[PDB]
């Protein structure tokens, strides 16, 4: 349970920073996904066999 308690907190921090999952409302910064998404810096992978470069 000591190993489990520690590891549980590390996982919850990553998910907040990267994707904003349960991000504290007092964190004024955008999460990494949200920062890119609001900037429009998003690339969709395609199904072109790379003919579309995607």
């Amino acid at each position: 349970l000591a190993r489990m308690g520690g590891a549980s907190i590390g996982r919850a921090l990553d998910a907040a920073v990267l994707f904003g999952h349960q991000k504290p409302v007092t964190w004024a910064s955008k999460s990494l996904f949200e920062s890119a998404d609001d900037a429009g810096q998003v690339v969709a992978v395609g199904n072109s066999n790379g003919v579309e470069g995607d």
Partner: protein
């Protein structure tokens, strides 16, 4: 009027060869491939973690 192979026949022994004679071979692989545990009884229990916080 001649001594042919059918007359000489009792004098004509055949030979034997081992060139195509092999035993079976052990082809089996799982005991060589995977981990082996020596059991001392019919059953062993193996506990595992299932869920966490």
């Amino acid at each position: 009027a001649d001594t042919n192979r059918t007359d000489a026949a009792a004098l004509i022994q055949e030979a034997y060869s081992d060139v195509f004679l092999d035993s079976v071979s052990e082809t089996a692989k799982v005991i060589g491939t995977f981990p082996v545990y020596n059991m001392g009884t019919k059953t062993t229990n193996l506990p595992v973690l299932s869920t966490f916080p």
